[PDB]
Amino acid sequence: STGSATTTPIDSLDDAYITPVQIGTPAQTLNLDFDTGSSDLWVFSSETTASEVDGQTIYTPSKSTTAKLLSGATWSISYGDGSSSSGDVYTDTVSVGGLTVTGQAVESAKKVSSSFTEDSTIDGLLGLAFSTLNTVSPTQQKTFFDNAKASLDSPVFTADLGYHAPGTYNFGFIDTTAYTGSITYTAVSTKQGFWEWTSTGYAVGSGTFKSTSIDGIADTGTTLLYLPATVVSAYWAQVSGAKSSSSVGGYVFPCSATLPSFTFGVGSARIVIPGDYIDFGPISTGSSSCFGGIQSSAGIGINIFGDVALKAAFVVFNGATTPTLGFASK
C-alpha cells in the first residue's frame, strides 16, 4: 500500500504545516501537525477541557463506531518549546492520504497548554519519530508509520515541505518526479528515539564550505534551524545590523536586509537554503526588526534541522531494519 497527502502551511511564515487525517467511522477529518520529532498521535477531542478549545476541530470517539477505549491507558507529553498536553487513549481507524491503519492509538487530550489552545489551525499532532518515545502508559503504543510499515510497498515516508506553499507527505514510495539530481543517504542513530544524523558541514552565502560534523535531528515539528552558536554567529555576521537579542529570544536582523543563503552538507552533497527561507518577519506587528530563521541550539541540548532546513530538500525517512535518511535538492 501507499498514501499521499498534501501538507499546508498554517500561516504566511510557514510556522507549521497541517495535513488532513481521517479518524474513526464515519471519518472525522482533523488537521494534524506531522512531527518527525515526537511519537504520539494526539487530538483535540470531546474530552478536552472546554475552556482550552478555541476553534479547533475535535475528535468525538462516541460518534465513531470503530473507537474503543484503551482501558487504563493515559498519556502526557512536553515539547521542546515548553508546550504540553495529556489525556486518555482510544484505538480507532486512521487514514492518511488513502493509507489506512486499523487499531491505531489515538490519544485524546483532556488538557492542552495555552500555545495549543491559541493556535486554532492545529487539531493535534501525528508523531513520526521512533515508537520508543511514545508516552502512553502503562502500555507504550506504536506510531502510525510503525503500524503501517509492514503493509507499505517500501518501508519509508517522505517529507516535501513547501516554501510559502503546500507540499506533500508520501508513505510507502519515493516519487522520483519530486526532486532533482540524486538522493544522498546518510546514517541514522535511533539511540535517542529521533531521526538523528550527522551533517558534514556548512557554508554561508557564496563562502567556502566548512567541513565539520554537526549531529542533529530531522524534525518536521520544529519551525526553525537550530545549530551550534559558532555556526549561527558565522551566518548572522554576514547580515549588517543582525544581533542576538536576549529580550526577543534570538537573532534578529533589519527587515530591510537581503539575507544570504545557508548550505548544509549531506555526505558529499549540499542542500542550499535560500536566504528568503530564513526571514520570519517582524518580531511584532509593524516592527522593522525581523526574526531570524537560523538560531542557536546552545540552550536546547541538540541541534535541530527543522522546517527551515527540511523545506529546501526532498527528505526520505527510511524505516528499513537499519534506518537511514535521504536528502535531495528539488
Curated annotation (Swiss-Prot):
GO molecular function term, any single one: aspartic-type endopeptidase activity
GO biological process, one term: proteolysis
Domain Peptidase A1: 17-328
Keywords recorded for this protein, A-Z: Aspartyl protease, Disulfide bond, Hydrolase, Protease, Signal, Zymogen
Disulfide links within the chain: C255-C290
EC number(s) on file: 3.4.23.22
Span covered, complete protein: 90 to 419 of 419
Domain of life: Eukaryota
Protein name: Endothiapepsin
UniProt organism field: Cryphonectria parasitica (Chestnut blight fungus)
EC class (word): hydrolase
Active site: D35, S199
Family: Belongs to the peptidase A1 family.
Presence of keyword Disulfide bond: yes
UniProt keyword Signal present: yes
Catalytic activity: Hydrolysis of proteins with specificity similar to that of pepsin A, prefers hydrophobic residues at P1 and P1', but does not cleave 14-Ala-|-Leu-15 in the B chain of insulin or Z-Glu-Tyr. Clots milk
